[PDB]
Symmetry: none
Subunit: 306 residues, 2 copies
């Protein structure tokens, strides 16, 4: 396969390794309880959280329903923090001060100790705003609760946002998707040629944005499948919550089932001419030269094209 090195970034199971729509791919103890937390190795471009029946944006600091998901005021203020502020903050750290924008944001979020637990490996995720050059640390690592109903989504208002786990790798631009591939269709390398993906499901999509949106909706998810009828502390932890009104969430019921490990309907071929989004769940291993198509993934930016 002449396509192996090129196609490496599209093996989402390998290179990302956790959920995309909902990333809760690891567990980490904070003060004696194991909490779920995002753990994917790639940035998720254009991902944010929509709070339903509300005008509050999710990057609004948590209420200390009026509030969002972001870190409340700390002293000194750790979040939000601009790119320049971050580089100045870490000036004495050779291995941190020069990391790319997104990786720096991830590492910065990763320096926030949870709940004065100095032993803990738990690290908060973050959102980077590329327009504002601002890093927002998320206090709430839950992504879907469908007190607050909400869901993850690509939305036109989120196009400059990137959702970042603690695990985002420093060379993500070499090894992860970002841009959509114009004039290219994902395929499978079989006996010296790029063949069509055998099984695809097709949907109407007015533009590339709408196709990327759909793929995202259907992509790898670490959200629980079985769960009680009412919200319970056990259900909250399974959704990625850690804190409730001034105490940690605990549950006698906590002892790997919910982890996708990157498995899902993560790829799409958008036919710009017929306005159909072609969605599949096997990793592609080549490209087909087809001028009618744009190749997208749930990780990819919903608009940007190369």
């Amino acid at each position: 396969n002449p396509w192996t090195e090129y196609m490496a970034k599209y093996d989402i199971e390998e290179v990302h390794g956790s959920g995309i729509r909902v990333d809760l791919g690891e567990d980490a103890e904070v003060a004696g309880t194991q909490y779920r937390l995002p753990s994917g190795k790639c940035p998720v471009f254009g991902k944010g959280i929509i709070i339903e029946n509300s005008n509050t944006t999710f990057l609004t600091p948590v209420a200390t329903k009026d509030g969002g998901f972001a870190f409340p005021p700390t002293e000194p203020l750790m979040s939000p923090m601009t790119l320049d502020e971050m580089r100045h903050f870490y000036k004495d750290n050779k291995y941190v001060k020069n990391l790319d924008e997104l990786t720096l944001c991830s590492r910065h979020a990763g320096n926030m100790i949870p709940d004065n637990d100095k032993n803990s490996n738990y690290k908060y995720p973050a959102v980077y705003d590329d327009k504002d050059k601002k890093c927002h640390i998320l206090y709430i690592a839950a992504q879907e609760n469908n007190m607050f109903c909400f869901r993850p989504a690509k939305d036109i208002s989120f196009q400059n946002y990137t959702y970042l786990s603690k695990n985002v790798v420093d060379n993500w631009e070499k090894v992860c998707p970002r841009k959509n591939l114009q004039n290219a269709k994902f395929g499978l390398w079989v006996d010296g040629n790029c063949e069509d993906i055998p099984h695809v499901n097709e949907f109407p999509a007015i533009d590339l944005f709408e196709c990327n949106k759909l793929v995202f909706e259907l992509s790898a998810s670490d959200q629980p499948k079985q769960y009680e009828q009412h919200l319970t502390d056990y259900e909250k932890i399974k959704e990625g919550f850690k804190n409730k009104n001034a105490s940690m969430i605990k549950s006698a019921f906590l002892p790997d089932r919910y982890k996708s490990h990157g498995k899902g309907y993560n790829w799409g071929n958008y036919n710009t001419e017929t306005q159909k989004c072609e969605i599949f769940n096997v990793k592609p291993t080549c490209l087909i030269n087809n001028s009618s198509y744009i190749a997208t993934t749930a990780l990819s930016h919903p608009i940007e094209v190369e």
Copy 2:
């Protein structure tokens, strides 16, 4: 309610009466020990077993690791057996010879005596393959074994590879076509009849589902299960019997701990789904539906139902 007679086949507790994802709804003695075995009265369309970290397919005869779940070769060969071979085999039996292929495969499997036990009521289940018109008697009636322990690990699933298979207990009824679900209902949504109207099911759990097959898979996964929740440390002989195993390498499995109804669903579960084809959402619920709503955006499915076939 004008829907009563029409909706009877969606009363899964009544018409099927056992687990769907894992069906172990009866016990039957073989050589002095009670074993668990499938007892559902309806066929389960598109159900097979996935063996983990293995190149072995579940319809391969048992190893006699390299093996599956199917009957080892017998003389005369009783399994696998084609429809035509079955009809010829039972040519002298008026009551069996002209049964529908599914009920026939169930009855054929039910004629295998377990472990030379002349008067046992234990009857092996079977899988009928509609593509090759072959009946496969299963020697292993276990359907799930994947505890954190050592995970020969396996689980039940609907999968594209299994779409022409039907998993058949010994109790599959001869008139299943009239009394059991099979086809999904296109342009229809399950509801509840309230005051001269078909109303929405009050509580549904909603999930993303790219197509009807995926919705049907999800419903099956959440459906009535007779599996022990008793996932514990090592796999003990008692645990094996609770999982539906009967044999282990030249002896019956036995246990002093076997008491002489707790893991039986009797068909109670998240057995139904309304799939919204326009929003790609699978809405799953655990109460029997009692009418249909005319909605072009939906397809009504059950855990029993074929994962593709529509009406």
